[PDB]
A paper describes a structure:
PsEst3, a psychrophilic esterase obtained from Paenibacillus sp. R4, which was isolated from the permafrost of Alaska, exhibits relatively high activity at low temperatures. Here, crystal structures of PsEst3 complexed with various ligands were generated and studied at atomic resolution, and biochemical studies were performed to analyze the structure–function relationship of PsEst3. The residues located in the active site, including the catalytic triad (Ser128, Asp199 and His227), were strictly conserved.
Four structures were obtained: a sulfate-bound form, the wild type bound to PMSF, a malonate-bound form of the S128A mutant and an apo form of the S128A mutant. Two unintentionally complexed ligands that were derived from the crystallization solution were detected in the PsEst3 structures: a sulfate and a malonate. Structural superposition of the sulfate-bound structure and the malonate-bound structure of the S128A mutant with the apo structure of the S128A mutant revealed r.m.s.d.s of 0.4 and 0.3 Å, respectively, indicating that the overall conformational changes caused by the ligands were not critical. In the sulfate-bound structure, a sulfate molecule occupied the active site near Ser128, interacting with Phe43, Arg44, Ser128 and His227 [Figs. 5(a) and 5(b)]. Compared with diethyl phosphonate, which mimicked the transition state interacting with the oxyanion hole, sulfate exhibited an approximate shift of 2.6 Å caused by hydrogen bonds between an O atom of sulfate and the N atoms of the 43-FR-44 main chain. Another O atom of sulfate was located near the oxyanion hole comprising the backbone N atoms of Arg129 and Phe43; however, its orientation did not directly mimic that of diethyl phosphonate.
Numbering used by the authors: 4 to 261
The structure:
């Protein structure tokens, strides 16, 4: 049982691109799909992501994780205005659309082993919110999990990004995850570490109050990265628990029960 890792690159407009990887144990059968989105400071090789992708591949998934367009732009020497424009939630939604379209058109590596009837999303931090938005707007997403994220987007930390300020202001209803969670009939899981930063914990309580239909799990002693921040020598009890709970939540919802 070898975990294969197949690199790919999706060419977008002009000089932009998405680099990604498919992680899979090749069993000559279609496997449910997990698409992973990294957080605002992440990239596909950051911290626990390679371990996480392999962990789900060992447990029966066809896994996709990838660099958002803004990562390749930065690495390619794009200037600050270009990188800032690519850093909106709106661009995340568009990059996810390119990943999912290429998956659904069987252009990703080993796509004959992807069960595209059974797509789940896993998003970390800021991508937890954008994954909820994407899932709510796309019927073909069957379930979504957010790790230490979920609340509606707002202006990023550090330097002012005006494109982010405009994106947030022109999309207040569209990006309101409390309203989206309340009406989404697909199962949503939010895992939140109890040691995380305290404006985030308050945002998470508003989601649970707004949308008690969904599933909210606390890991009381875990921080924003479940201890798996870069570099990654080994897993942690908080990351293993988040993986277990995420896995259990997905399989619990594969069969339609009533
Ligand atoms: O209250 N909670 O346990 C909770 C609330 C939001 C997200 C995760 C857990």
């Amino acid at each position: 049982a070898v975990v294969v890792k197949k690199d790919f690159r999706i060419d977008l407009e002009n000089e932009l691109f998405i680099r990604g990887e498919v992680t899979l144990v090749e069993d000559q059968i279609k496997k449910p799909v997990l698409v992973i989105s990294h957080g605002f400071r992440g990239y596909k090789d950051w911290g626990f992501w390679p371990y996480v992708a392999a962990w789900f591949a060992e447990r029966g998934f066809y896994v996709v994780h990838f660099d958002f367009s803004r990562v390749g732009a930065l690495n390619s020497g794009a200037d600050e205005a270009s990188v800032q424009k690519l850093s909106t939630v709106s661009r995340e939604l568009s990059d996810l659309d390119a990943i999912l379209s290429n998956l659904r058109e069987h252009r990703l590596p080993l796509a004959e082993q992807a069960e595209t009837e059974r797509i789940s999303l896993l998003g970390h931090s800021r991508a937890g919110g954008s994954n909820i938005i994407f899932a709510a707007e796309h019927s073909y997403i069957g379930s979504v999990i957010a790790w230490n994220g979920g609340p509606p987007p707002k202006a990023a930390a550090g330097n002012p990004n005006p494109f982010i300020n405009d994106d947030v202001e022109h999309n207040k209803q569209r990006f309101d995850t409390a309203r989206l969670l309340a009406s989404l009939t697909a199962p949503v899981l939010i895992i939140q570490g109890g040691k995380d930063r305290e404006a985030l914990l308050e945002g998470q309580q508003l989601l649970k109050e707004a949308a008690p239909n969904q599933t909210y799990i606390s890991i009381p002693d875990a921080d924003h990265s479940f201890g798996g921040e870069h570099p990654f020598h080994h897993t942690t009890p908080y990351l293993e628990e988040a993986l277990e709970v995420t896995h259990s939540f997905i399989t619990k919802h594969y069969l339609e029960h009533h």
